[PDB]
Amino acid sequence: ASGSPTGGQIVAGSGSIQTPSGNQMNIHQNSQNMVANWNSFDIGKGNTVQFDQPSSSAVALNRVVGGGESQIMGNLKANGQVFLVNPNGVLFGEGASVSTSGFVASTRDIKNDDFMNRRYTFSGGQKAGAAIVNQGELTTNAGGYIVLAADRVSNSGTIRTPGGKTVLAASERITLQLDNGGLMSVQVTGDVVNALVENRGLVSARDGQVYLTALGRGMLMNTVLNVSGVVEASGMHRQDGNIVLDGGDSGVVHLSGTLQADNASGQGGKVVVQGKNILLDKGSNITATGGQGGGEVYVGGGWQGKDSNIRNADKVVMQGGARIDVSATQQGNGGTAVLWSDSYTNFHGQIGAKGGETGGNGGRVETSSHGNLQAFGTVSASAA
């Protein structure tokens, strides 16, 4: 645990490093893509690391080749984009602030040549027990992205990617395709033992998208994806989903917090919750309401499990006191809410799909299973 990154050297691209003076380290970048290796990459409280980059779409890769888990307690700022790779993991402290146009923290490595060719695929080299934990504040400029990729990813603080994307991913491999400085798409493949993505804090991608994906192996009923806080992607409805949870083909996806994709001045967003076993616990709240129309919430599959782009669950359990709301609030039709499984759907919660107060028809709700169905909750899908 040091106060500032040390042992830095530019090994690809063109740039310069200045050690701390006045509690701030300055890293200047000349090329569009730059690689710096670091003995360590810690930032103490009250200290800043400032990247001065040629373009908001420039990328600096920072690889820790020393031994310690990165301790980021102070500030990291950049006008462009920053990748931080540490096989031993990263902790962002309660006071930490990271503010960039796009930020990746990964325990999986990337090859220098791939990165300098703008082929952003990360895999291999992680140490056993390495996690990425955020207890501070990670934020990007509008349209940027934040990607945290490790065997275990935990957010108890705040992540904000307005008009952009947040991706928390526990997988063996992750590939980022960037388009004009924005995150165009993400592919995650390969299972990881004890894979875990947990959000006790706040993830907010206003007018953006949040994607949480954990791929474990042989969990039985160990949790792979746990959201006890708030995931919010209010704004324009997106066909590919405003909030997408994917627990893979093993383990439990547990929601006790809130997934929020509302749109007071339009149609509600789309929330997709996938996994093998999904538990919507008491107090959980999935809301995709819209002033001009309700949104779509799919838990365990699409309508009757016939959406190839949504994984079909084996079991879905919605506890009493859990709620889903796809209502239209002002004018327009209620949205669509689906609980689906292949083997067992136990519905004890509340699903709302009302039409607008000033007009509109009730929405469409399905609580079903290819196998066993226990439907004991409440569904309100009526006009006002």
Numbering used by the authors: -3 to 380
Sentences from the paper on this structure:
EtpA is exported through a Gram-negative, two-partner secretion system (TPSS, type Vb) comprised of the secreted EtpA passenger (TpsA) protein and EtpB (TpsB) transporter that is integrated into the outer bacterial membrane. Outer membrane TspB proteins recognise the N-terminal TPS domain of their cognate TpsA to initiate exoprotein translocation across the outer membrane with simultaneous folding nucleated by the N-terminus.
The crystal structure of EtpA67-447 solved at 1.76 Å resolution revealed a right-handed parallel β-helix with two extra-helical hairpins and an N-terminal β-strand cap. The asymmetric unit of the EtpA67-447 crystals contained four symmetrically independent but equivalent monomers. Strands from adjacent turns align to create the parallel β-sheets PB1, PB2 and PB3 with 13, 11 and 14 β-strands, respectively. While β-strands β1 and β2 (red) form part of PB1 and PB2, they align antiparallel to the otherwise parallel β-sheets and serve to cap the β-helix. Two loops connecting physically adjoining β-strands β12-β14 and β19-β22, are extended to create an extra helical domain consisting of α-helix α1 and β-strands β13, and β20 and β21, respectively. The extra-β-helical secondary structure elements all pack onto the outer face of β-sheet PB1 broadly alligned (anti-) parallel to its β-strands.
